[PDB]
Design a protein around this nucleic acid. Structure first.
Ligand code: ADP
Ligand code: ADP
Ligand code: MG
Ligand code: MG
Lengths: 615, 603
DNA sequence: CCCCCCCCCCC
DNA sequence: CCCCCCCCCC
């Protein structure tokens, strides 16, 4: 055998099984003569035979590929297939429900990819990674973990036959450290890319950097039809395949805006839509507790021939399946913005859009990364509207004016432009992504804030530069707390004083806009109402007192009597619920990390010492 | 800033986790070979900063150490100081006691109270992944902590751990898989081998490797936890390690022998009527729940169906299935008004603690893996349990006095049984054993420190079959056997090696369904290559007729035929468990029957 | 200027 | 014949 017969048979082997051999033959031409590297040429070919056997095993295990006929991606798959075949990067943009997420991996398989390497397929959320993987496996009549596997936090079903591997973008970023060239994959699908989270942008930057060193790798950026040109120019003017099928125009009804109920507008819209022809209603909510209160309210009403279905992140597998079951009458679906573009709620014809969303945004006033509930962008509101366009005569009720909509900015800020650089640097450092200033971002953060973010991380003990940024074990712990680094540092210090509960209450409060209102009209009853929670020692302790006051009285009152209590005590109902959501999410993360949380409230003595760590 | 030395830096390694201490120690050993003292100093100055960094991981873990409490009612809780002192002062301890003592849930706490679990993890093995997850959830609950925190678990497909995990529940197979990336098991300062009396290949492999390992791991402590079945064998293995017997008071159980009268003349009705007669006999006794042992889940379903047709007064029939919901999985520990009859397999013999059981009914059988020399196949027959097992089943109604275990066989039948179950190592074909050791890197089978070595006359035969199948290959000086890609795929199939090769070959041709049909039929006794087609066609016919008529009407069909419904049921049972294993390995199975003679080329 | 591998493996 | 240190690499 010659050097060419062994080099060219590697192109049949797996990607990982071609690296250890192709640059392995170069060692054979080095020790300075043959007749010992002519018998090694014969014996390393035995290993090349056994390698190609696993390729044939994977081929023998590939299922027959089928597609639902009713999906635009199914109908248009030939154009998509030729675009993927002929370009290293393709932007696939299409209306929600076109079949991008469930059919794109199949098209990659039909094209022959996924044998010599895996087709990695990222999602923003673990629930979507798992749910998508079950669905494709089922469409192909396979078991999850066979041809279609998945890898999320706490759950990893990827066998030796797996060709498509669903995962969260977070999961894919964490694998770079161990596999700098991502050699496990021949194809990578970045899905829901229009969310422009830090994770997505981290992947888009890293992949663009990686491409020159991976001529065999193919990239498919999959997203809603929202300024996809930006993805295109980033990947050196990669083609954009717009895969939207037929969509019908949607009627937009504007329903803008002392004892009026907070949810009264939603009740009105619900009753109005109930008078329309059959079709389910999708209601966009700002969070889980808002969805809970709204489901409880709508049930109290006993809407005739109407069933209420709240989409919680904590929904069991039994509940998630009822979303796609046939149902008798009219169904009202309550969801956060996950069903905006990511989820595909079936049977939807009418939408109620309060117009707000929880979004991560750094406050220069408070010096804190926060989660303001602010009006959504036009592009975001148009996605919510678009969910009615699957059929004709869809109705979208917007709980705001037309002037308001026209005024709102066109697009949503990508997370990279609304996050303090300390958080960004910490994640990059934790992921081994390199120096923030040389990273090929799609859109770069403000370079003038890099030094401030580096100093903060040092002052917090998160990194070691006294050049060569390294995480400290404390820093590794901060990077896993999804709140502002300064606030998270305080939480980590509270565990040494047995007041993590209070640290999380205070952190939660500081991560939102002040729930204590003070309108122009009264300006005195609001002040006297909130003075019931002043603490002589610190402004922060007022939040703990207000927190304990709120907890006791959601127990003494019903869900409806509570909302009256909020406007009775000049408290923002939505912000209170958000305060409760964030604390719950934070408490679950903290406890999963083994950080001790005090059961009984720790007195205001040890809370002082722990507070004086942040700044 | 100032001069550092080997002595100073080495003294700081002891503030570190054993992993870090080992690494830095070997890094310092290298610096002893550096001829340039300036270079040594520079390395020291750098290494000292990293030691400072690494020592912080210990402080974070200490900050997460939970407060330890013990249920007052448990014998292990009541003897915790004696247990704690034995663990402290010995490198290996054998903790043996009746089921329900609190060995599984309280031992990991005891190690944490000793101070272990910080510089290394307390690994805790189980034979079943469900047990590993369930125990970790339980201890975490008892400690008022979230699973994945200080108490975590790692099983196939589900890893709930964190940087602060101190106790790590896992299957013994998970621990064995970790050996080839950590030969010293430096992740752990403590390893608890639970249910050790089951004497599976996995357990014996761990006991063998642990015994080899201990001289290289003076900072490691081992706790062998088992039922009270010949624990002196474990003691002798680990150089006469002390045995701490943690049972509470012993409450003798009354044994009634009720050999099955062949009154109906039907083997399946005759057994059901024996269970009915046992249930009657027991309901004439003081209040108490009944635990009926079964050999499979198909048997549980049929027997539970039968007992319900009886219209029993104020009695609930609770079947225990492996795939039970976490809702139905909870009710077994909850209060009930009347009498409850619980049907379970031998998972309820020693591993599980079904509460409130005063009476036991024991048919005396279980599925056991045993290599048949006649057929040259590793079979999974139902066979009479050992005396040790039947006493374990009897023990499960001895929580208080006046327990009654009814044995559906005679005393002579009981005495004819062997004193102990054969350990798996002594009833498994050597080809499977050698394959499994080679996949794990456990070394030559003739030098492995087995608790009980297999008969070495079979070793060369096993190597031959594994060479013929293409699972292994010998190399440079015929000193170590090495695995091939095919053999690794064979390592993952819990069936006979020759049958396993067939399953993989069926994957090429889309007839893994048929390969499983043949495989499960060969691992049992028939209800009756051209012979294998009879297996498939019988299977297909039975499946169709099973969906055609009711469950009751289907039993009438088997008896109006030269077919035994019991063997049919065990065939379907084995197949189902086989299909579950195949699916978890990502091997595709055809839905429709493979077309004719598509299997010929696969045999 | 320290640590470890193959028949994809480590101090 | 083939690679590595922030526990990495043909
Ligand atoms: N798990 C599921 N069960 C039933 N139907 C589903 C499931 N997932 C997706 N679908 C349906 O398949 C269609 C395609 O959805 P998807 O592939 O997510 O499209 P896109 O990613 O373009 O929004 C949708 O209309 C949806 O209703
Ligand atoms: N999952 C569980 N739910 C509720 N109680 C349990 C659970 N597991 C164990 N227990 C209680 O703890 C006791 C101790 O059981 P265990 O620690 O498994 O003892 P052993 O391992 O010695 O059989 C049991 O008898 C039971 O009362
Ligand atoms: Mg999608
Ligand atoms: Mg136990």
């Amino acid at each position: 055998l010659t050097f060419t017969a062994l080099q060219q048979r590697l192109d049949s082997l797996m990607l990982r099984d071609r690296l250890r051999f192709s640059r392995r033959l170069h060692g054979v031409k080095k020790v300075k003569n043959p007749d010992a590297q002519q018998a090694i040429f014969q014996e390393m070919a035995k290993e090349i035979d056994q390698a190609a056997g696993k390729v044939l095993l994977r081929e023998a295990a590939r299922p027959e590929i089928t597609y639902p006929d009713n999906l635009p991606v199914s109908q248009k798959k030939q154009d998509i297939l030729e675009a993927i075949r002929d370009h290293q990067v393709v932007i696939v943009a299409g209306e929600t429900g076109s079949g991008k997420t469930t059919q794109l991996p199949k098209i990659c398989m039909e094209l022959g990819r996924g044998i010599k390497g895996l087709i990695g397929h990222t999602q923003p959320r673990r629930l979507a990674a798992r749910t998508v993987a079950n669905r494709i496996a089922e469409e192909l009549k396979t078991e999850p973990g066979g041809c279609i596997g998945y890898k999320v936090r706490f759950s990893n079903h990827v066998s030796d036959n797996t060709m498509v591997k669903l995962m969260t973008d977070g999961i894919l970023l964490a694998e770079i450290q161990q596999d700098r060239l991502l050699m496990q994959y021949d194809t990578i699908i970045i899905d829901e890319a229009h969310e422009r989270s830090l994770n997505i942008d981290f992947l888009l930057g890293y992949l663009k950097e990686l491409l020159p060193r991976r001529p065999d790798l193919k990239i498919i950026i999959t997203s809603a039809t929202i300024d996809p040109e930006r993805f295109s120019r980033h990947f050196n003017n990669a083609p954009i395949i717009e895969v939207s099928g037929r969509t019908y125009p949607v009627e937009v009804r504007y329903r803008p805006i002392t004892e009026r109920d907070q949810l009264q507008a939603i009740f009105d819209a619900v009753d109005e839509l109930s008078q329309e022809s059959p079709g389910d209603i999708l209601i966009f909510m700002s969070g889980e507790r808002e969805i809970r209160d709204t489901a409880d309210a709508l049930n109290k009403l006993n809407l005739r021939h109407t069933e209420i279905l709240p989409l919680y992140a904590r929904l069991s597998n039994s509940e998630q399946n009822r979303v796609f079951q046939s149902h008798s009458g009219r169904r009202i679906v309550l969801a956060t913005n996950v069903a905006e573009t990511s989820l595909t709620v079936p049977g939807i014809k009418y939408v109620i859009d309060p117009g707000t969303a929880r979004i991560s945004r750094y406050s220069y006033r408070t010096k804190v990364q926060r989660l303001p509930i602010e009006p959504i962008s036009q592009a975001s509101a148009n996605q919510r509207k678009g969910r009615c366009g699957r059929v004709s005569e869809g109705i979208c009720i917007r709980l705001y004016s037309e002037d308001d909509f026209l005024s709102r900015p066109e697009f949503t800020d990508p997370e990279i432009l609304r996050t303090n650089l300390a958080s960004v640097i910490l994640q990059m450092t934790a992921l081994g992504l390199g120096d923030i200033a040389a990273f090929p971002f799609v859109e770069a953060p403000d370079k003038r804030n890099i030094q401030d973010g580096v100093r903060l991380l040092e002052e917090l003990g998160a990194i070691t530069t006294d050049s060569a940024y390294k995480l400290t074990p404390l820093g590794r712990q901060l990077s896993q707390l999804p709140v502002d680094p300064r606030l998270a540092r305080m939480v980590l210090e509270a565990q040494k004083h047995g007041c993590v509960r209070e640290a999380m209450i205070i952190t939660s409060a500081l991560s939102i806009q002040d729930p204590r209102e003070r309108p122009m009209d009264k300006q005195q009853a609001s002040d006297e109402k909130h003075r019931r929670f002043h603490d002589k020692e610190s402004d922060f302790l007022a939040f703990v007192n207000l927190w304990n006051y709120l907890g006791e009285q959601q127990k003494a009152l019903s869900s409806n009597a509570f909302r009256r209590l909020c406007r009775t005590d000049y408290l923002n109902y939505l912000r209170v619920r958000e305060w409760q959501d964030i604390y719950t999410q934070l408490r679950q993360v903290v406890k999963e990390l083994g950080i001790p949380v005090n059961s009984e409230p720790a007195e205001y003595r040890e809370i002082h010492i722990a507070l004086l760590t942040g700044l």
